Amino acid sequence: HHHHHHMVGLIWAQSTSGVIGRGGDIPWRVPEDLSHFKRITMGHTVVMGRRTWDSLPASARPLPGRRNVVLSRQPGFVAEGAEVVGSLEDALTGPEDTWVIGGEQIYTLALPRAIRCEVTEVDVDLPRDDDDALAPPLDETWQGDVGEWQVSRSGLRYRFHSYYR
Ligand SMILES: NC(=O)c1ccc[n+]([C@@H]2O[C@H](COP(=O)([O-])OP(=O)(O)OC[C@H]3O[C@@H](n4cnc5c(N)ncnc54)[C@H](OP(=O)(O)O)[C@@H]3O)[C@@H](O)[C@H]2O)c1
Ligand SMILES: CCc1nc(N)nc(N)c1OCCCOc1ccccc1CCC(=O)O
């Protein structure tokens, strides 16, 4: 069951070790995760920190088919094709389904408001570094399921987790 009144969800991909980002990029190749990310977010509102906006390739700025919302404390930051807001509150003003798409700073900020998480886990040798962007923890309030391990065209093992509360 999926709730549809001010539903806030978080969607991320992470290594088993908990890394979501390094040096400004997502440090692995899983094309099936791009497919999975689009499948969930397409047509919905997407919320993202300024760093994540910067990390997008110009060919996906803004993310097509989604209402793009960008969080920045910088007064007057321009995000062409996206709405820029200065608080988590202004970001989540819409009642339509809204997916927080990263990065770590925004996951940590939106997590008390979220009632769904869609997590890709990637089995990649990626020992965590203090400068990485890291995955948010999931406490015991979450119910959910975990898919089977699959193998990517890139050779990496991955699997999908889906949680809710
Ligand atoms: N694996 C995944 O699923 C995934 C998904 C998305 C991103 N990533 C990776 O994660 C990294 C980015 O994550 P990050 O945590 O470093 O950055 P981030 O969360 O994407 O963005 C950080 C920025 O958000 C703004 N911000 C934060 N809190 C705010 C608040 N309360 N009010 C207003 N604005 C606020 C600030 O922008 P200003 O400095 O402009 O003020 C801050 O610098 C990148 O390497 C990216 O590739 C991975
Ligand atoms: C696809 C990576 C990704 N995967 C999951 N499961 N959750 C995210 N929040 C996420 O990050 C979304 C922001 C970065 O997205 C991209 C990064 C590099 C190339 C293309 C895209 C997205 C393009 C699109 O979705 O249309």
Residue with the smallest CA separation from ligand 2 atom 5 is: 12
- Using an 8 Å Cβ cutoff, are 158 and 150 in contact? yes
Q: What does the CA dihedral 35, 139, 72, 59 come to, rounded to 10 degrees?
A: -10
Residue nearest to atom 1 of ligand 2 (CA): 34
Q: Is 57 in the pocket of ligand 2 (CB under 6 A)?
A: yes
102 Cβ closer than 6 Å to some ligand 2 atom: yes
52 lines ligand 1 (CB under 6 A): yes
Name which of 109, 136, 137 is nearest 21 in CA terms. Answer: 136
Q: How far apart are CA 91 and CA 77, in angstroms?
A: 15
- Structure resolution in Å? 2.0
CB distance 101 to 11 below 8 Å: yes
Question: Could you give the C-alpha distances from 111 to 9, 11, 16, 19, 21, in angstroms and in order?
Answer: 8, 11, 20, 17, 18
Per-residue HEC secondary structure of the chain comes to CCCCCCCEEEEEEEECCCEEEECCECCCCCHHHHHHHHHHHCCCEEEEEHHHHHHCCHHHCCCCCCEEEEECCCCCCCCCCCEEECCHHHHCCCCCCEEECCCHHHHHHHHHHCCEEEEEEEECCCCCCCCCEECCCCCCCCEEEECCCEECCCCCEEEEEEEEC
Tokens 């008390």 belong to residue? 112
Handedness of CA 31, 32, 34, 35 (dihedral sign): positive
Residue nearest ligand 1's atom 26 by CA: 72
- C-alpha 118/C-alpha 155 separation (Å) is 22
Method: X-ray
* Closest to 75 in 3D by CA, of 50, 96, 98, 55: 50
Residue with CA nearest ligand 1 atom 3: 12
Beta carbon of 13 within 6 Å of any ligand 1 atom: yes
d(CA 100, CA 69): 9
Q: Cα of 64 to ligand 2 centre, how many Å?
A: 12
**Rg of the chain taking only CA atoms, in angstroms:** 15
Q: Is 3 in the pocket of ligand 2 (CB under 6 A)?
A: no
Q: Is ligand 2 within 6 A of the CB of residue 42? A: no
Q: Would you give the distance in Å from CA 70 to the centre of its chain?
A: 13
